[PDB]
Design an enzyme around this catalytic site. Structure first.
Site, PDB file in Angstrom:
ATOM      1  CG  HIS A  84      -4.564   3.232   3.129  1.00  0.00           C
ATOM      2  ND1 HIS A  84      -3.492   2.735   3.839  1.00  0.00           N
ATOM      3  CD2 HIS A  84      -5.406   3.773   4.046  1.00  0.00           C
ATOM      4  CE1 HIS A  84      -3.685   2.953   5.129  1.00  0.00           C
ATOM      5  NE2 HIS A  84      -4.835   3.595   5.279  1.00  0.00           N
ATOM      6  CD  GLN A 128      -6.995   1.950  10.601  1.00  0.00           C
ATOM      7  OE1 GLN A 128      -7.882   2.736  10.927  1.00  0.00           O
ATOM      8  NE2 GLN A 128      -5.837   2.349  10.110  1.00  0.00           N
ATOM      9  CB  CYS A 136       2.711   3.308   6.024  1.00  0.00           C
ATOM     10  SG  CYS A 136       2.825   1.720   6.819  1.00  0.00           S
ATOM     11  CB  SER A 171      -3.609   5.143   8.791  1.00  0.00           C
ATOM     12  OG  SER A 171      -3.858   3.979   9.542  1.00  0.00           O
ATOM     13  CG  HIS A 214      -0.477   0.443   2.474  1.00  0.00           C
ATOM     14  ND1 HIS A 214      -0.984   1.570   3.080  1.00  0.00           N
ATOM     15  CD2 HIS A 214       0.557   0.036   3.248  1.00  0.00           C
ATOM     16  CE1 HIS A 214      -0.329   1.792   4.208  1.00  0.00           C
ATOM     17  NE2 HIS A 214       0.630   0.891   4.317  1.00  0.00           N
TER      18      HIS A 214
END
Ligand SMILES: CC(=O)c1cc[nH]n1
Length: 147
Positions: free
Chosen positions: A141, A115, A97, A138, A43
């Site tokens: 993505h 998630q 990330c 977060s 991702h």
């Protein structure tokens, strides 16, 4: 009719039908091709000010807005889809990330670990397929299913 999540839609700018997936946010002109205990995905995460942790290895204090983060994601997708850039190259350079260091690879995972918007998108992807923007706490993505 169509694989999980996929629906027909109408292009405003061309009047041609296209396909949209309301779980992965993928869109493509072509009709989709043809569930596992595990998938493996990479991702690219772009964080923003409302991110659960507005910090990353790229930026001590991430200050961009949801909207600015979505536009970045939109530009990365356009570059991947045009062949100008590859997903894992852009993950390494720009993912907020820490998996950026493994070209965005998160390894294999089951349902119940990530998630859920991410989990849902991941499991509705077929191997080799990319998502559109996927929203989680977060950030935003892009997801590539690798296995
Ligand atoms: C660039 C890349 O590896 C990709 C994106 C969608 N599928 N594969």
């Amino acid at each position: 009719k169509l694989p999980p999540g996929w629906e027909k839609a109408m292009s405003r700018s061309s009047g041609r039908v296209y396909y949209f997936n309301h779980i992965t946010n993928a869109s493509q002109w072509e009709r989709p091709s043809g569930e596992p205990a595990r998938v493996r995905c990479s991702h690219l995460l772009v964080k923003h000010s409302q991110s659960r942790r507005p910090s990353s290895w790229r930026q001590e204090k991430i200050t961009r807005t949801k909207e600015e983060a979505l536009e970045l994601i939109n530009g990365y997708i356009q570059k991947i889809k045009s062949g100008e850039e590859d997903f894992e190259s852009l993950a390494s350079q720009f993912s907020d990330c820490s998996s950026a260091k493994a070209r965005g690879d998160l390894g294999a995972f089951s349902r119940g670990q990530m998630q859920k918007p991410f989990e849902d998108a991941s499991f509705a992807l077929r191997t080799g397929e990319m998502s559109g923007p996927v929203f989680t706490d977060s950030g935003i993505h892009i997801i590539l299913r690798t296995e």
